[PDB]
Structures are given as C-alpha cells and as structure tokens.
C-alpha cells in the first residue's frame, strides 16, 4: 500500500553526481592508461557487471586503485562514467566504437544495445 | 546532444538497495534508541538535509556510528530509510505522525509535504 515519489531516483542520482564532482566519499580511482577517474564503488557496481564482479571479490573489494585493460580508451570510459552518474550518454560518430567496446568490457548491456542499433542504422 | 536511458536512475537505486540488503559496502550504522540500521553515507546524504550536513562535516564524515535524537521513532526511521533506497513510502494512519516528525528531523521536504497533505485531508 506504499505511495511513490516519481522523481526520487533521479534526485538521488543527481546528488550522487554532485558528490562525485566535489570528490566527497569517493573510495576508488579507476586508472585507464594515463588517466585517473575517482568514483564511488557502490555506483560503479550498480551500473556495471564488471565492477559488480570486482567489488564483490573478497580481495579486490578493499583496493583503492583499479587498473583497466590497456586497450580501454579513456574518453570512452569518461563518457560511460558520466552516463553512470547521470543517465545521459554522449554518443557521437567519433566516439561510438570506443563507447561500445568500453560498454562491452564494463558489461553495460543497455549501452551496448543502443550502440549496436546506432551502428546498424549507419551501414 | 546526449541520449538518455529512462530507467537508469531507478535501476541504480534498485542495485543500491540490493547492496544494502546484502550489507555490501555499508559504511555507517544509524542508532535510533535500541535499534541499528546499516546504510551507505552517500545515499543518506543524497536523500536527507540532516545527513548531508553531518557527512560534509570534517569530523563527523569519518564516524562509523551516528546516534539520532532519542525522540526519533525507530519504525519512522525504518520507513524513511526504505523510502531513501526505493522511492516507496509505507505511509499509514498508525505511523503518519512518526513518519512526518522523522522526515522533519531528517530534512526530507517532499515526505514532510505529503504527510502534511494526508493529515490535512483527515481533519
């Protein structure tokens, strides 16, 4: 018999992104080649099958630094990290291949789906 | 020029609630009289003006235990904590006064608003 506040989940995510911008309570650095990205492990796990697996691991759960595969593109990661915290995906002709490869590695199925659909439409 | 995934914020919040149920990466215990509630500081701050103030404080940000005012009702807190993690508010005739008082203390303005409207309709 609950009532539901429609905008609550969006409001929570907006405040999680504000915490990220101010670097408040971030507990991990994701290293992608020469670039570093600070984030909250809980948000990464909530958005990515890869981070969900990493941070449920009894040893990796305690690491403050995670190094991604050297084939991962930093811009593609940056775009996906912004998506995680905002629901908005900056998908462009110039970045779609990197975004799709990064989303496959991160196991972000909905992003992979749409990248596939956008690529199919251009061929 | 971003695209947006409509269900993303709800999906994130669902996974944050799953982490809470499994006690994964919870970093605080909220003590309300004889009861204890484990939570994620980032979610508490994102939902509550009181926790936002507490966890931005340079000393309180590092505490693993937060004790609420002894006038706070544990059930009212439990209902609001569930709301934080789900967008669903279990508002009943038997708990509305406790929920509203707890929401005022926690500075959860949208919950206070609706409690006020539900009370006004019954008088």
């Amino acid at each position: 018999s609950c009532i539901q506040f429609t905008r609550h989940a969006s409001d929570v995510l907006l405040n999680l992104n504000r915490l990220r911008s101010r670097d408040i309570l971030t507990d991990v650095v994701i290293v992608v080649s020469r670039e570093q990205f600070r984030a909250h492990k809980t948000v990464l796990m909530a958005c990515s099958g890869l981070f969900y697996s990493i941070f449920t691991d009894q040893l990796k759960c305690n690491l403050s630094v995670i190094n991604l595969d050297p084939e991962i593109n930093p811009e593609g990661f940056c775009i996906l990290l912004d998506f995680m915290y905002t629901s908005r995906l900056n998908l462009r002709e110039g970045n779609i291949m990197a975004v799709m490869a990064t989303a496959m590695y991160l196991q972000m199925e909905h992003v992979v789906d749409t990248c596939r659909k956008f690529i199919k439409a251009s061929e | 020029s971003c695209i947006q995934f409509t269900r993303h914020a709800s999906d994130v919040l669902l996974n944050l609630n799953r982490l809470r149920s499994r006690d994964i990466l919870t970093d605080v215990v909220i003590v309300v009289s004889r009861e204890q509630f484990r939570a994620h500081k980032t979610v508490l701050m994102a939902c509550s003006g009181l926790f936002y103030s507490i966890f931005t404080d340079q000393l309180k940000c590092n505490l693993s235990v937060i004790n609420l005012d002894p006038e706070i009702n544990p059930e009212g807190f439990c209902i609001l904590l569930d709301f934080m993690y789900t967008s669903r508010l279990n508002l009943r005739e038997g708990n509305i006064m406790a929920v509203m008082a707890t929401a005022m203390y926690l500075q959860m303005e949208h919950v206070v608003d609706t409690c006020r409207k539900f009370i006004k309709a019954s008088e």
Partner: peptide, 4 residues
C-alpha cells in the same frame, strides 16, 4: 507522489 503516485500510486505505483
């Protein structure tokens, strides 16, 4: 607020 809505009835979900």
């Amino acid at each position: 607020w809505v009835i979900p």
